[PDB]
RNA sequence: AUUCAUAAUAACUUUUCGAAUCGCAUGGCCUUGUGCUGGCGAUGGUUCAUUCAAAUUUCUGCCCUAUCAACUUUCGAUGGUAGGAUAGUGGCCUACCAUGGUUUCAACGGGUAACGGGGAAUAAGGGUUCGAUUCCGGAGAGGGAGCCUGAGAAACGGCUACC
RNA sequence: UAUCUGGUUGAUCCUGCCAGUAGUCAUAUGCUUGUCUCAAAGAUUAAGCCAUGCAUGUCUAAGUAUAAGCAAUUUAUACAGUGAAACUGCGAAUGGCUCAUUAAAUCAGUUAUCGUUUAUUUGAUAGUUCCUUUACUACAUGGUAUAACUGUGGUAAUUCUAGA
């Protein structure tokens, strides 16, 4: 006797589990952006497919249609707010063919590389895994964290961290100390 | 089965309390007392959820075993009376006062009141009978018994009461253009003054009210209270006055000031 | 310490249990974990009441460090901190003593024997060694 | 033997099970209204008794070692007011609170007699009880009188503002 | 909507209830007597209302089967009159009386690896399958039956008998 | 994300099934298993059987205490401080578990009690009861037993009990 803990997955398999084209734009997707898996690209996939699903229930609904204005501007609004959906396309119409990886180009280590930082994605990665990158004055050590296009300006290295001052290192520190008994 | 019941899982209890489905197995059951179970404060919701003046039920049982808290002008130790609607709750620290109505989304709100309008309450009367010696009394919606009414007094009317003697004050009659305030269904917590009812011989009447903006609804005749005439009510109404805005005109209002 | 800058939110007086609470929030950049018997003392300072009628709880460290948000108490003398505070933070701080007590199971067989016996039980005890003789 | 009691006057030297109840002896209840089925043993003297319960009523010639050199005392006093009265047979003005029986107890050096209590004895405390009650019956009474009397004068004056109201109806 | 609430008359009862109870404070009045008054509570108690419930109850709605087509009424089936029982209505039971009631719009019988819903999986739309199990209602304490206490139990971490 | 593919023929177009394919708060099993959050879990077969130990007891200022209990109140010679035991009053009919029975039965929504019971809570609510009711009468208040307790005991044993 307790409220059971809601839960769900969030990631769609193909219907089908062999076919050239799919198996190369996936993997297309997977080395440009430095992702692990294809899991994080079905999860993209399932989390626009809601989308798309919402949108044409809004559109095929009547012009003006109280449910509609208020659920449209709220789902345009989100896009926005993170990026995905740009400021001369918010007709609700341009929301059904956004893309796949529109959201991946909002994804955390896409942007640390962005303003440089990195200088190759797989350098972001294992960047963010390390705890360096604080997109305030917070470390977030997760590698798809969909800054909301206000956060994008404060990507900065987390002060309590090297690259940010304050400590050398670990192996520097240990480095350091050999040329000491080395010197002597 | 085989007996009354004692316990009140959560999941179970009213949605209008606000309790958080996690952190605990159970809510408060509300005792027997002048209010259904499902429409019933009780305390230890209002003390701890509401106020924030207590972290567990423990301080809630501390706070109330000492005669801080009082309803009705009496101190009701006990953490789960069920406090219902125009209770009047005094708190001699803080010097604060309360009364029990229901905001426009149909959850009880706070409401301050002064220490004047703690000094009476709303009642809507259930039943005009004959007591023992022919002596008439009203059953009023909290389970007040009052004998000896004024003879105008009829069901769906609203007495006010002392609430230093049982004695009514004055009434309201349950009559077209009268303000009313909704207590239960769709409507919760909306005023909005009668224009005329529905006689439905058998059973069930209704009552179609429309608001200050002109909106108009139907709801049934047991869940409308009369609180006074149009426009000037007999009490104070929580913040909103019951006007049950639209959620695209609700958001603007929330995007004014940010 | 260093920068600890503690900073108490949300501050609302509760003369029903005379006190007053507030979240307190604590900055602690280049250290970790300010260690509430620290935190007691700067608290207390601050409302000059005393360090035996405050008390602090909670304190999760936010992730990555470099900050602590917890919850707090300040009562109006040690008589209403030491009748309204739980037992087992009241030793947390030395106020109170943790009396000795068995485990539950040996408490729950030591009732059960009890059950067992109708009276005082002093005559059985006499009555027991008479028949042990023979 | 095996310790199965004598019931009072029952038949039957044989032992036998009965149904025992409340107020029925070789049996103590755990529970409001519950009853066991108990072996007891039947009242006629057999030889398979193990002990026998006697009480001497008259005595004889002969002196017993244990029965009639010693004596033992009763353990309690009398607690309620007429007890004591009828211990001593006194009167019903006699102030029998200092009738009273006490024992001392030496714990060390320091005695007390810690005489137990008179119940049912008469205090200005009970005649406040008494004279509240009483009273509280008369203005009780007359509170409803006096708003019965309220109640029909409106009442009758509500009727006269309708002799008068349909006076003017019908011409 | 009432033979309702309520009141009145005539009686009846083997007779219910109408404070022989407890804590704290001790104050006023005199013809100062352990004189007379006098507060805040607790517990209990008759009737009504109220709340927590219970019992019965209206309408519509349930899976597979005809290699189940007729079923129910000996001794209860369907209905009436009267009574007993019950907290109450009622074939709930009894006496007398009538021959009634359900069924191809599927009664009745058999099966269910059937507790019923809120729900779960998969689905373009329509559906199919599942739901012992976090909530609601029901039933049971190895199988039966019977019963004391009590406001409430056919109670089993209560009793009684049989298996 | 409103999609199909392989298999009857020498080859063809069909009907048609078999096979493949994706999912499963559907189980089981195999190989393997570094981190944080969250989390079902003796239901299916056997509502089959159970050693053991727990799961129901309970007090205030305000029912009954001479503990032949503990200590000093010292305001106290009747008690008035804490408090074992026991009598009393409540609760034990809630909770928890399981799904065997059960197919207009349960149950869901919707109705009624103008057809009933209801401890508890909340709000009201007994001037009328000296019974030949002028000595019958205690109304500054009236009786009994018993537990706890002392001591004698019986049985191998039970939360067994008897006599005084
Ligand atoms: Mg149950
Ligand atoms: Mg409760
Ligand atoms: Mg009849
Ligand atoms: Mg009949
Ligand atoms: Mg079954
Ligand atoms: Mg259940
Ligand atoms: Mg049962
Ligand atoms: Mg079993
Ligand atoms: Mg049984
Ligand atoms: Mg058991
Ligand atoms: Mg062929
Ligand atoms: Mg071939
Ligand atoms: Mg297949
Ligand atoms: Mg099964
Ligand atoms: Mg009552």
């Not at chain 3, 199971?105 to 039980?121: E, L, S, V």
């Not at chain 4, 019903?92 to 029986?101: A, L, P, Q």
């Amino acid at each position: 006797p307790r409220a059971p803990r809601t839960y769900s997955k969030t990631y769609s398999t193909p219907k089908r589990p062999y076919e050239s084209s799919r198996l190369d734009a996936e993997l297309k997707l997977a080395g440009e952006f430095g992702l692990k898996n294809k899991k994080e690209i079905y999860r993209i996939s399932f989390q626009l497919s809601k989308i798309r699903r919402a949108a044409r229930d809004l559109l095929t609904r009547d012009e003006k249609d109280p449910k509609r204005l208020f659920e449209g501007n709220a789902l345009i609004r989100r896009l926005v707010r993170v990026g995905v959906l740009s400021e001369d396309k918010k007709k609700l119409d341009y929301v059904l063919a956004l893309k796949v990886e529109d959201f991946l180009e909002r994804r955390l280590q896409t942007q640390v590389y962005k303003l440089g930082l990195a200088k190759s994605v797989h350098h972001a990665r294992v960047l963010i895994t390390q705890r360096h990158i604080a997109v305030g004055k917070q470390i977030v050590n997760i590698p798809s964290f969909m800054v909301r296009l206000d956060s994008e300006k404060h990507i900065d290295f987390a002060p309590t961290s090297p690259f940010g001052g304050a400590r050398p290192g670990r192996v520097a520190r240990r480095n350091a100390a050999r040329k000491a008994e080395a010197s002597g | 089965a085989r007996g009354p019941k004692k316990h009140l899982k959560r999941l179970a209890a009213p949605h209008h309390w606000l309790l958080d489905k996690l952190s605990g197995c159970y809510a408060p059951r509300p005792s027997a007392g002048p209010h259904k179970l499902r429409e019933s404060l009780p305390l230890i919701v209002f003390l701890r959820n509401r106020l924030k003046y207590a972290l567990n039920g423990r301080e809630v049982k501390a706070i109330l075993m000492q005669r801080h808290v009082k309803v009705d002008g009496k101190v009701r130790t006990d953490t789960t009376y069920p406090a219902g609607f125009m209770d009047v709750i005094t708190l001699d620290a803080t010097n604060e006062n309360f009364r029990l109505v229901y905001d426009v989304k149909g959850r009880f709100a706070v409401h301050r009141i002064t220490d004047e309008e703690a000094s009476y309450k709303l009642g809507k009367v259930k039943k005009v009978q004959l007591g023992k010696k022919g002596v008439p009394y009203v059953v009023t919606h909290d389970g007040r018994t009052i004998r000896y009414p004024d003879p105008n007094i009829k069901v769906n009317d609203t007495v006010k009461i002392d609430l230093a003697s049982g004695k009514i004050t004055d009434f309201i009659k349950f009559d077209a253009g009268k303000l009313v305030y909704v207590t239960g269904g769709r409507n919760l917590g909306r005023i909005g003054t009668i224009v005329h009812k529905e006689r439905h011989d058998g059973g069930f009447d209704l009552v179609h009210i429309k608001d200050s903006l002109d909106n108009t609804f139907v709801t049934r005749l047991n869940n409308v209270f009369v609180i006074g005439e149009q426009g000037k009510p007999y009490i104070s109404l929580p913040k909103g006055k019951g006007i049950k805005l639209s959620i695209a005109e609700e958001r603007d209002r929330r995007r004014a000031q940010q | 310490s260093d920068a600890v800058t503690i900073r108490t939110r949300k501050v609302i007086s509760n003369p029903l249990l005379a006190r007053k609470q507030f979240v307190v929030d604590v900055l602690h950049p280049n250290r970790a974990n300010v260690s509430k018997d620290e935190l007691r003392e700067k608290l207390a300072e601050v409302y000059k009441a005393e360090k035996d009628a405050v008390s602090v709880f909670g304190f999760r460290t936010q992730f990555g460090g470099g900050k602590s948000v917890g919850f707090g108490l300040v009562y109006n003398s040690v008589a209403e901190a030491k009748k309204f505070e739980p037992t087992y933070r009241l030793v947390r701080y030395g106020l109170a003593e943790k009396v000795e007590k068995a485990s539950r199971q040996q408490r729950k067989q030591k009732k059960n024997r009890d059950k067992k016996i109708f009276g005082t039980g002093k005559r059985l005890a006499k009555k027991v060694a008479r028949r042990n003789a023979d | 033997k095996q310790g199965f009691p004598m019931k009072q006057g029952v038949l039957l030297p044989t032992r036998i099970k009965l149904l025992l109840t409340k107020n029925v002896s070789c049996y103590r209840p755990r529970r409001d209204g519950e009853r066991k089925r108990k072996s007891v043993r039947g009242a006629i003297v057999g030889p398979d008794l193990a002990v026998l319960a006697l009480v001497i009523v008259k005595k004889g010639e002969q002196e017993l070692e244990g029965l009639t050199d010693t004596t033992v005392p009763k353990r309690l006093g009398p607690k309620r007011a007429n007890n004591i009265r009828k211990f001593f047979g006194l009167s019903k003005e006699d102030d029998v609170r200092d009738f009273v029986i006490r024992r001392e107890v030496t714990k060390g050096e320091k005695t007390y007699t810690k005489a137990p209590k008179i119940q049912r004895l008469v205090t200005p405390q009970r005649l406040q009880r008494k004279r509240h009650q009483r009273a509280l019956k008369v203005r009780n009474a007359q509170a409803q009188r006096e708003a019965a009397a309220e109640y029909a004068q409106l009442l009758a004056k509500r009727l006269s503002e309708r002799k008068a109201e349909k006076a003017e109806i019908r011409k």
